[PDB]
Amino acid sequence: MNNQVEPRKLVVYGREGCHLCEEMIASLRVLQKKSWFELEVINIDGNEHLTRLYNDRVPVLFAVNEDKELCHYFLDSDVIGAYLS
Numbered sequence: 441m442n443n444q445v446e447p448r449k450l451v452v453y454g455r456e457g458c459h460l461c462e463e464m465i466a467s468l469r470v471l472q473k474k475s476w477f478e479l480e481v482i483n484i485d486g487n488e489h490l491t492r493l494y495n496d497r498v499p500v501l502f503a504v505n506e507d508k509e510l511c512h513y514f515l516d517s518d519v520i521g522a523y524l525s
Contacts, residue, residue, distance in 0.1 A: 447475065447476045447477055447478075447524070448477055448503060448504060448505040448506060448523075448524065449477055449478045449480070449504035449505055450468065450477040450478060450479065450480075450501055450502065450503060450504060450510075450520070450524075451480045451481075451482055451501075451502040451504055452464060452465070452468070452479070452480070452481050452482070452499055452500065452501055452502070453481075453490055453494055453498055453499070453500040453502060454481055454482070454483065454484065454498045454499050454500075455483055455484055455485040455498060456483075456485070458498070458499065460498075460499045460513040460514065461481065461498075461499045461513075463515075464499050464501070464513070464514075464515055465479065465481070467515045467517075468501075468515075471520070474525065475524045475525040477524055478504075484498065494512075497512050497513070498512070498513060499512060499513035499514075500512045500513070501515070501520065503523065510523055
């Protein structure tokens with residue numbers, strides 16, 4: 441009868457060990473308990489194309505299976521809340 445669909449994956453673009461990244465990771469790990477979206481941290485320092493996009497506006501929460509940016513450093517929560525579930 442009913443059956444929830446498969447979730448959307450989320451990627452966080454960043455560079456090296458940044459506190460905001462860790463804080464967002466912890467935030468998303470908590471959210472993963474409510475809504476699974478995986479967690480992938482990708483270094484933009486190598487991909488200068490991504491650095492051209494973000495650079496300073498990193499810990500960026502990218503929506504996979506959709507291909508758009510949702511949030512960035514300092515979790516908005518509201519936006520991904522409206523998005524993920």
